[PDB]
Amino acid sequence: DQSREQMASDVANNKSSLEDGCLSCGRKNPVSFHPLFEGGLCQTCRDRFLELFYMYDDDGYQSYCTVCCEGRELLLCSNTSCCRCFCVECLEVLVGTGTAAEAKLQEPWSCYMCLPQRCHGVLRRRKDWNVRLQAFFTSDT
Amino acid sequence: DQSREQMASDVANNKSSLEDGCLSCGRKNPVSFHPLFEGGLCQTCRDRFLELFYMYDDDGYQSYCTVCCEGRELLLCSNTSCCRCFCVECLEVLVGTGTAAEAKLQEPWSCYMCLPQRCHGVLRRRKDWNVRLQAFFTSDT
Amino acid sequence: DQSREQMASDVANNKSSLEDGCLSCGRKNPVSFHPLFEGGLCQTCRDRFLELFYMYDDDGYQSYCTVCCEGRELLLCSNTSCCRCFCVECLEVLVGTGTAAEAKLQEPWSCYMCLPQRCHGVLRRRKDWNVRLQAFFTSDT
Ligand SMILES: [Br-]
Ligand SMILES: [Br-]
Ligand SMILES: [Br-]
Ligand SMILES: [Zn+2]
Ligand SMILES: [Zn+2]
Ligand SMILES: [Zn+2]
Ligand SMILES: [Zn+2]
Ligand SMILES: [Zn+2]
Ligand SMILES: [Zn+2]
Ligand SMILES: [Zn+2]
Ligand SMILES: [Zn+2]
Ligand SMILES: [Zn+2]
């Protein structure tokens, strides 16, 4: 089974497209797409987002990583219009080693949806993220 | 058992949080959140929005209250890019006594999603309403 | 009004409203609305969008016509923030004869969701398309 470290390395070296790996778990030939970041989304990782219990914590931050839906070791966007979260693992594997530690020291921290810069490592916000999100909500499938 | 009048009074006097009452019906400890306004949303009030038949009337205005999903005594946003509706009861209870009558005299009336001002009484548009609405559409539970 | 050619002609010459025909197939008295363009949407044409499997082709353009969901002869929006598609038939019948041929030679082509001009033939982008699309995603029926 393709690790996320292997997927990130192949993407950076133009061996695979982001679209042919699950951005969340690393597996090959996912059925669907992550709507916010360049990358596929497998059926299992897509169902995690749909099947969350509480989507927010008691402080009004999201209870889940925007990329992989993990709830542990979340970095919290300081933009009160956003309140999205990214996990340590996604920062380490998609942006690069040390990103998580650097981000935990930033005061305030702005997430990868809020940053003007579109790409960091193989974490690339979609140019068409808004239309992609509309497409993601359109399908029953 | 908790009335909406009791919930609004406790919120204004910092006795309870908007998030621990249903903004639509007043019930304590709702399961989810109203996506547009600060406030909880119970399972049954959430199901009203999901189970609407016709969402628009013959004049192109929404057939339901943005807060509680009621069809009776709707005020109609005059912004042709919006066409959302708010009922008399939600205005009276969340904004305050006389709001509906004051709104009927406005030349023209702009709804609480269109007004630059975020808060009126305990009706507070979310700073993160757009991300909250994306979270609301993501959930299949 | 039965064929799409008949519906377009009646609309242009003030015999019918766009809202009383299916924008996708031409059928009279459709149950719902097209969320992006003025026009009804019948149950069958609405179900095409809900039952899409792949929303995107291998080049990151949408796999379906924005208006009718079929097409096969898709024109591709050149805006990398959009990547929507419109079929030859929808352009010929809603905008007018020659539109498809003109659009295939245009370098680059901007689709009817991107163009500043709201109206071309009987194709009118909704003033409230964003709120209409939120209403479209709200219904679980
Ligand atoms: Br694999
Ligand atoms: Br949306
Ligand atoms: Br509940
Ligand atoms: Zn996955
Ligand atoms: Zn993550
Ligand atoms: Zn953010
Ligand atoms: Zn309720
Ligand atoms: Zn109401
Ligand atoms: Zn409004
Ligand atoms: Zn139809
Ligand atoms: Zn078409
Ligand atoms: Zn476009």
Curated annotation (Swiss-Prot), chains A, B, C:
Q: What does this protein do?
A: Required for genome-wide de novo methylation and is essential for the establishment of DNA methylation patterns during development. DNA methylation is coordinated with methylation of histones. May preferentially methylates nucleosomal DNA within the nucleosome core region. May function as transcriptional co-repressor by associating with CBX4 and independently of DNA methylation. Seems to be involved in gene silencing.
Which disease?
Answer: Immunodeficiency-centromeric instability-facial anomalies syndrome 1: A rare disorder characterized by a variable immunodeficiency resulting in recurrent infections, facial anomalies, and branching of chromosomes 1, 9, and 16. Other variable symptoms include growth retardation, failure to thrive, and psychomotor retardation. Laboratory studies show limited hypomethylation of DNA in a small fraction of the genome in some, but not all, patients.
For the region Interaction with the PRC2/EED-EZH2 complex, give the residue spans.
22-114
Tell me the organism.
Answer: Homo sapiens
* Gene that produces this protein: DNMT3B
- PTM info: Sumoylated.
Please give the tissue specificity annotation from the record for this chain: Ubiquitous; highly expressed in fetal liver, heart, kidney, placenta, and at lower levels in spleen, colon, brain, liver, small intestine, lung, peripheral blood mononuclear cells, and skeletal muscle. Isoform 1 is expressed in all tissues except brain, skeletal muscle and PBMC, 3 is ubiquitous, 4 is expressed in all tissues except brain, skeletal muscle, lung and prostate and 5 is detectable only in testis and at very low level in brain and prostate.
**What sequence ranges are listed for the domain ADD?**
10-141
Q: Which domain of life is it from?
A: Eukaryota
Which protein family is named in the record?
Answer: Belongs to the class I-like SAM-binding methyltransferase superfamily. C5-methyltransferase family.
Zn finger intervals (PHD-type): 62-118
Protein name stated in the entry: DNA (cytosine-5)-methyltransferase 3B
Provide the assembly information.
Interacts with BAZ2A/TIP5, SUV39H1 and CBX4. Interacts with UHRF1. Interacts with DNMT1 and DNMT3A, SETDB1, UBL1, UBE2I9 and ZHX1. Interacts with the PRC2/EED-EZH2 complex.
